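Usage example:
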Amino acid sequence: MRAELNQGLIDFLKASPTPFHATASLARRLEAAGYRRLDERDAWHTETGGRYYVTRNDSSLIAIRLGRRSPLESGFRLVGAHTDSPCLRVKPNPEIARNGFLQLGVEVYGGALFAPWFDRDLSLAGRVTFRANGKLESRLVDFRKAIAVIPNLAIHLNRAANEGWPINAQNELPPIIAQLAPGEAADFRLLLDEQLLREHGITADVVLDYELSFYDTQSAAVVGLNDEFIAGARLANLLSCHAGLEALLNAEGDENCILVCTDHEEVPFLEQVLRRLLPEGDAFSRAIQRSLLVSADNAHGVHPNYADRHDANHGPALNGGPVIKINSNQRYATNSETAGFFRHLCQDSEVPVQSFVTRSDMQVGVRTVDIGLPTFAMHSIRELAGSHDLAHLVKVLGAFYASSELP
Amino acid sequence: MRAELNQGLIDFLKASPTPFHATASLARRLEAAGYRRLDERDAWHTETGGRYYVTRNDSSLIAIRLGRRSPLESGFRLVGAHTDSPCLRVKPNPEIARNGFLQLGVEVYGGALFAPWFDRDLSLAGRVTFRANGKLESRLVDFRKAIAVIPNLAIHLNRAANEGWPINAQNELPPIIAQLAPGEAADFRLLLDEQLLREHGITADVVLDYELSFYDTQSAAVVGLNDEFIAGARLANLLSCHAGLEALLNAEGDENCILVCTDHEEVPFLEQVLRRLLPEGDAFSRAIQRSLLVSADNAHGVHPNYADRHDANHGPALNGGPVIKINSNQRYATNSETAGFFRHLCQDSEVPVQSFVTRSDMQVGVRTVDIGLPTFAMHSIRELAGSHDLAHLVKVLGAFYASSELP
Amino acid sequence: MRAELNQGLIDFLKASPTPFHATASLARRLEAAGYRRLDERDAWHTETGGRYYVTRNDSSLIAIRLGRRSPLESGFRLVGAHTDSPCLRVKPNPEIARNGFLQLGVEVYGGALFAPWFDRDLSLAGRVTFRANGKLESRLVDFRKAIAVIPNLAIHLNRAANEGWPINAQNELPPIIAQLAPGEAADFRLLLDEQLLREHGITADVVLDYELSFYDTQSAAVVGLNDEFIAGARLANLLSCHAGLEALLNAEGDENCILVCTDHEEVPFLEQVLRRLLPEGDAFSRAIQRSLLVSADNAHGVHPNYADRHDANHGPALNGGPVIKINSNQRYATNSETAGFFRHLCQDSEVPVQSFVTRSDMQVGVRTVDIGLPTFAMHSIRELAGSHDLAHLVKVLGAFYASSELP
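Running the assembly step on the lines above writes:
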């Protein structure tokens, strides 16, 4: 699957600057493929062999493909990933006016590496809540244009820059967006009002509150001498969202398949949705003990400039296939049964597979295997992954969704 | 003057990833406007009204517009800038093969800020010297494609990351360009030999040596909510080269005008060229003491996130015009006469002008005014300047080239 | 409201030295309003228009108003607060007899500020479990009288006292209660036995175990030149409990309303109670996704003597209204929809509203808005809040409970 798979990823990442936009993008694909949307507030609706999806807070999405087999006989095959990434979010009273500039105060979301955010052309996107015609409403907004930058202090006025300093997020991260005339008031909510007009044809009476992320206007791209790598924001964790969605949509077989993409993994929806697909009593527990969750988030590749940060025996290579993550050591994480099963699926699929244990010096109750695609620069504004690995992941996720018996 | 000057800047930066490429791009524009090349190795016959340029080492360039009066009487009007910028250069035996990767060893050129170089899509460009058909030759090469990246270490594996660490250039900076093998051999010279074929049709007996810089594939761009800023690598000092050239080519009047763009700022040609424009004896000193040099670098704008790093009285603004830079501790730097003359040309041109001396706790013999366009993130891989400043500098350098005479 | 409201608070604080006493004070008010206690051990027979409350461990309480529309169509309006505060609790073998005194060993509960506990007139209260007539029983006890003090070491014997020292909880906090005329054994359980007699007229065979907090005998009070402030212990979080209860008892409309006042916030009852209010299966998830929780905890006012400890843009004022708390790094916390809904509710009730994110350098699945009354000196033994703010919160919580539409 190429190449086409990698251009698909690049398009998905571009359409998905934010968990909201990721979720909307997953949704449009689910709907083009015949999946029907359920609202949790309504009575469902639900039919053996139906394909459905449900969202929560417009930022988390569960897709459900019911098969022929009873879950009380065959369980579910669940794939889990997450729609959020570390980033910079605009504060609720954000306007900072100094030395002729307008800046926006930000809060750090997740474990963001701060340095990489400097000297990048940033735009802004996310959810805005407002009142129009007596109604409380929300829409998504994406400025698209490069409107913000967080410049570094020049080396000439910060000479031990390369010796390193403790980056103060409060002081140092606020992006510059404009210059103000001598002259003039700053109103960020008025700018969101203008953006609602331009993007949706809507005129808000009052803009109330928002969840708006800065993001890099540089698109993801295949890089390297033989196109071995992909570079881009949000590879952790939209690459897995995309892989999982692609495997669900192409899935063969008779199994009950679930794709769970949740928000806030960088900080009950699944349980609550699964309990609604089941008769109650002992059904939930019987279904779950026959099920398996493949929990897909990125792993660290052994980095050649920082090799000793890895276990010599457990250094995953980019383009070396999914990594089974061991920490034995957490409750419902990889164990011998789930690791073994996954490992056998890889060999059946002719996909190489790696191992990684989190190095010796540095809830529904479903069995799980924790897996990751090897990744460098995790939590930077621009990460690096293998250009062969999306294909490997989609293939092994497809095999999982069609798999007959678990361990 | 609007988009056109800024778009012209963006095109010039994109054609000029290296001092060699900058020189070649200035030479092509000068030839298109009728300037002819003088070879330093040969006798020159130079006339009143002539338009010439001369290069040295293919990385430095002086353009000469002779007016109707001898420089012995009317002097020269010189604008100085530089073709080089801080960057990373490939070492002469650079292949590093570890953890399945091919990396290239690099040296830091100039006072580069290291951090901003991480997680960027890099290409490579510069001079290659080789033997073809027993002839020693050189050409320029630019791979164009993003073939390299210097990944950050993931936050998970470098958790104090945001608290700063002294980046080790020898260990941390070598870019990844490919995956090998095994036991595939790596030969960078062979790779240059292929690029010589692909780009120039040239076969090459042996590739001997090279001067190659990594550079960002992301183009420069107008950014900001009201398009107030320009972001790009090499704004220091290519912005000034371009302004000077645009001023030289368009300047009214008939003065003796010189544009000097030299390599190895950031670390005799001028004197040796200008001597050859004059008769023997005392002519040189006479013309020089009637001349004035505007030495155009970039200045630090007062940064709103780091504002107390400037003098409170001498904080220049992006888009507030050229800055006259004072340093009494020189050389032949700005003095009252040269600063006065510049300040008066600005007022006549209706261009605003600023001043700047450093915080008080931080040779031909030609009189000089040291000026700069205000700039943030000097010596990063991506700096920021004002989108109105280019027009301002071109106007005033234009008035300067048209001046008779001196303060 | 007034004035009455503030005296009502002062009285509630006085009757509520412990989570057990706060719970019994809420219970008594709820019974006098006609709400009826449901026992979690029993099957419930629950009716539209009902009026109920349930306690667990005698220290958490949930009050329920059932309206005539089903929660499946209209959701619940929940307000959450907590009955506990940081304090010093008596150890299980606590008698310390030294230098002629009797002291009681203490445990620190919550993140209490130590310094403020010194040089205060303390009493003692809480739950005593004992055997009387062979049977195992609990009662609440409150000594009322100032029986304990934790004195500072004098300046003369601690001359660097004002330069700060690390207060050791084990050694420095044990309060003095008496002098032993030795004599003379020290038996705390006997003392507790005498208090049971004095306060309840029961005679106890043996005192087994207890949960006893020291607390300040100084009543809460209106302070300030214009009576702008309220000072007293436990304003975090008994102000919110009080305001919630007042809002619930006076709420207009007939919506489904919950007041949840839980123990141990400072360190499943809600979920387990809500399920019993609904039919089987899908009713729970439907009701919840239609519900909203206003989670009411004190927030930090910007302190004029320590202002830079706030974001200069998000520095909430005492008497400036409830504060909407934003922290994007929490799963079911304020979001743009719940913030916006609450912001508009305040504007519609004519109540001023503020926002707070922290400085950037510093589970039933219900949607939530986290709010707080601006406060100084949490969690001292004596905190400070605005004397207008209780009125603001009671109004806005009234409007929420009377609100048909939820975000």
